[PDB]
Ligand binder design. Structure first.
Ligand SMILES: CCCCCCCCCCCC(=O)O
Ligand SMILES: CCCCCCCCCCCC(=O)O
Ligand SMILES: CCCCCCCCCCCC(=O)O
Ligand SMILES: [Ca+2]
Ligand SMILES: [Ca+2]
Ligand SMILES: [Zn+2]
Ligand SMILES: [Zn+2]
Lengths: 382, 382
C-alpha cells in the first residue's frame, strides 16, 4: 500500500555500481553509510528503486539500459546505432521494475551526476523516438525497440537532477576524455571482463567479456580491434562541453513533466580570482577541482570538485526559474533551480565522503526526505 | 489484376447489418445513399469487402467471426470461452473472402466505431493467441482454432479506425449498458430470432433462435434461462470505459502494422462550459451527445454524438503521433492520429445521415478515396 503513487527510480552517474554489481570495498552508492537511501525510504513506506546501468557507457547506451531496467526485457541499442559505432546490438536482459510500464503509468526519475543526463535522453526517446532507428526499421523491417518509436507520453512524472553536468565539465575535456586516461579506463574494463570477473563495468557490448574457452591473450587480441578505443560513444566524451551540448541540442521540455535541479559548491576564491577546492572536498577530486577552478573564463570556475556550477544549475539553452528552498516546486515544463548547497561537493550528495564529518547523516536524510516531499507535491497536483 | 495488392476489409460497428442480412428499411451501412462504398470502389478497380459480424455481440465473439469471415470455415468461439460465459461453442459457417489467408498474404483492415476495436482484438489473437484457450486445449485435447494459437504474423498490413471508441464511451456506461436498455435490446434479439425471421442480430449463440416445432411461449421460457441477460460478454459492456480499458490492457502495437485513426466533433461549447450537439447531428444521437457533453471531466466532453474525442484519437495507453492531412501516413507501429473532422458526427463517416445536406456525397467519396490512397502508400513502402 506504498505511500507514493508513482515509483521513484534513482539513477547513478559516471562511475556508479549498485547492489550486487558493486564489489565489496566499493561504497554503497546511494547514501554510503550516512543514509542508506533505498533501505530507509522503504522503511518509511515509499516505493523506491536503484537503477543499475553502464558505469563507463555513453548516455545513449545508458538511456537504453535505463528503459529496460524499468520495463524489463533484453537491451536493444538499435540496429543503426550498433552499426554506426561498432558495438553489439543486444545486451543484458533485465527482470523489470514494472513490466506494466506504458502511457498513464508514471515513474519519478532522480539522477545523480551523469544520471541526470541519462534521465533526460531516455525521456526524449520515449516521447519523440529516434529518427535514425525509425528510418532504419522503415528500410529493413524486423524489430524495433518501443523506446525508439515515439508517441509515448505520460510515462514520467518528474525529472530531478543532483550535481548533473548539464553543460559538461572541463574535468572531462582536459583529463578524463584524453587518450591517456581513456586507455587506462578501457584496460580496467578489459581486465574486469575476464572469465572470473564478478562485476560488470558497462562496456561488454564492445567485446569486453572473455569467452569461456578463450585464452586471456586471445581475448586481448580480439578486443584490441574494437572501435571503443577511439569512439565518441562512451561516458568520457558525453561528459565534455561538446558532448553535453549535443545532448542539449536534441532534448526539450516536456510541458507535462516536473523539472527540478540541485547544485553544490565546494571551492573558494583565491586573491587572483581563481577557484580552489575547500578542505573537505573528497581528496580524489582535488585535481579535477583545480582544472575547473583555473579556467580562463570566470563563470566556469566555481565547482563541486568535478562539475562547475554553471553546468549543474540547468541545461543552458533550456528554460529555468530560480526557486527558493521551501516554496512548493510544482511548476511543470520548466527547470526549477534550487539554491546552491554551500560546501557540498559532488559526492556529498550521495554521502560517500567518509572523511567529511561536517556533512552529517541526518542532514542527508533531510535532503532526501525533502526530495520525496516535492515528489508527493507533484503527485498531488493533476 | 485489382489496383490494390492486399484486399481491404470494412468492419461495421455496434448496430451494423450488411448486405443480405440488412432488412429493407435499414440503410446501406457503408456509405448510405451518399457514396456506395463497396460498389463504387470496385468500379474504380479496388478489391474491397464488407465484413458481416455480430451486431450486439462482444468484441470477442465478433473478432472470432471476423477471422472466419476472412478465412472461411465454421465459427469456433473457443471451448473455454464458451464454457465460461455460457454460450454455444460453434456458430455459423462462412464461405471465406480468401480461403488461402496465412502469413505473407496480407489484408487491410478498416473499422467504423466498434469495428476498430474488433480489428484490434482479432489481430491480437493472430499474433499472440489466447492463453485461456491454449491452456484449455493443453488440459482437454480436442480441437483449437488457429485463431487462438499464436505466431501468426504478416497477416494484416494496416489497421485504420473511423470514430472508434478506443477508450469507451460514457454513452455506454450511462445509457445503453443499463439493465433497462440491455433488456430492451435482448427482447429485440429474441423477437428477431423467431422462426419466420429473416435477419440475424448476432446473438444466436445465446439461444435466440426459435426451433422449428417450438411455440413462441416455449421459446421465451427456454431463452429466459440464458446467461446473456446478465453476461459481460456482449457489445454494451465492451463499449463502456471499463470494457474498453480491458481491451487496451491486453492489446499492443505490432511494430510492423500501419495504424491510423479518424475522429469527428459535432458538439459546441455552451456558456456554462459543457458541450451540446450541433444542428446537423443525427437526431437519434442527441441524447447520448448531451450525456457525454455534460461530463464532470472537461477533457471528456467534446464528442461526435456518441463517442468522446479523447476516446477516438487513440487507445490512451498506446503510442500515437499527430499527423497532418496531406503528408503520407506511412509510419509503422504508432497510431497516426488524423486532424479532427470538424462537424462530422459519428454516423457522417458512413454517410447514413440522410437529413445532413451539409455532408455531401462527393466529400464522402474523397474521404474514402483518401483512405485507399493511404493504403496504397503502405503497400508502396516496407
Ligand atoms: C577513472 C578516472 C576518471 C575520472 C575523470 C573525471 C571526469 C569528470 C566527470 C564528472 C561527472 C559525474 O560525476 O558523473
Ligand atoms: C440501443 C441504443 C444504445 C446506443 C448507445 C451506445 C453507444 C456506443 C458507442 C457507439 C459505437 C458504434 O457505433 O459501434
Ligand atoms: C423523446 C422521447 C421521450 C423520452 C425522453 C428522453 C429522450 C429519449 C431519447 C432516447 C435515446 C435514443 O433513442 O437512443
Ligand atoms: Ca565533501
Ligand atoms: Ca451529421
Ligand atoms: Zn552505444
Ligand atoms: Zn462470447
Amino acid at each position: 500500500q506504498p505511500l507514493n503513487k508513482y515509483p521513484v527510480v534513482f539513477v547513478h552517474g559516471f562511475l556508479g555500481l549498485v547492489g550486487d554489481n558493486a564489489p565489496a570495498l566499493y561504497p554503497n552508492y546511494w547514501g554510503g553509510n550516512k543514509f542508506k537511501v533505498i533501505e530507509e525510504l522503504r522503511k518509511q513506506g515509499y516505493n523506491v528503486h536503484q537503477a543499475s546501468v553502464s558505469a563507463f557507457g555513453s548516455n545513449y547506451d545508458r538511456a537504453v539500459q535505463l528503459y529496460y531496467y524499468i520495463k524489463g526485457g533484453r537491451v536493444d541499442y538499435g540496429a543503426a546505432h550498433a552499426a554506426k559505432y561498432g558495438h553489439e546490438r543486444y545486451g543484458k536482459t533485465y527482470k523489470g521494475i514494472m513490466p506494466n510500464w506504458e502511457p498513464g503509468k508514471k515513474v519519478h526519475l532522480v539522477g545523480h551526476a551523469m544520471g541526470g543526463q541519462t534521465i533526460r535522453l531516455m525521456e526524449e526517446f520515449l516521447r519523440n523516438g529516434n529518427k535514425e532507428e525509425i528510418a532504419y526499421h522503415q528500410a529493413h523491417g524486423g524489430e524495433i525497440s518501443p523506446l525508439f518509436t515515439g508517441g509515448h507520453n505520460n510515462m514520467v512524472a518528474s525529472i530531478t537532477t543532483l550535481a548533473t553536468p548539464h553543460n559538461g565539465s572541463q574535468a572531462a575535456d582536459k583529463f578524463g576524455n584524453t587518450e591517456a586516461v581513456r586507455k587506462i579506463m578501457f584496460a580496467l574494463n578489459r581486465f574486469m571482463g575476464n572469465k572470473y570477473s564478478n562485476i560488470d563495468l558497462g562496456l561488454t557490448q564492445w567485446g569486453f567479456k572473455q569467452l569461456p574457452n578463450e585464452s586471456y591473450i586471445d581475448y586481448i587480441k580480439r578486443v584490441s580491434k574494437s572501435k571503443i578505443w577511439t569512439s565518441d560513444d562512451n561516458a568520457a566524451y558525453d561528459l565534455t562541453l561538446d558532448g553535453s551540448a549535443k545532448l542539449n541540442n536534441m532534448t526539450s521540455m516536456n510541458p507535462n513533466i516536473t523539472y527540478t535541479t540541485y547544485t553544490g559548491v565546494s571551492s573558494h576564491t583565491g586573491p587572483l580570482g581563481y577557484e580552489n577546492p575547500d578542505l573537505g572536498t573528497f581528496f580524489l577530486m582535488d585535481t579535477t577541482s583545480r582544472i575547473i577552478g583555473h579556467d580562463a573564463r570566470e563563470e566556469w570556475r566555481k565547482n563541486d570538485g568535478v562539475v562547475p556550477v554553471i553546468s549543474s544549475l540547468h541545461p543552458s539553452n533550456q528554460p529555468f526559474v530560480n526557486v527558493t528552498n521551501n516554496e512548493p516546486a510544482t511548476r511543470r515544463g520548466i527547470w526549477q533551480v534550487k539554491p546552491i548547497l554551500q560546501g557540498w561537493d559532488h559526492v556529498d550528495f550521495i554521502g560517500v565522503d567518509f572523511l567529511d564529518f561536517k556533512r552529517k547523516g541526518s542532514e542527508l536524510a533531510n535532503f532526501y526526505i525533502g526530495i520525496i516531499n516535492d515528489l508527493l507535491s507533484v503527485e498531488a497536483t493533476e
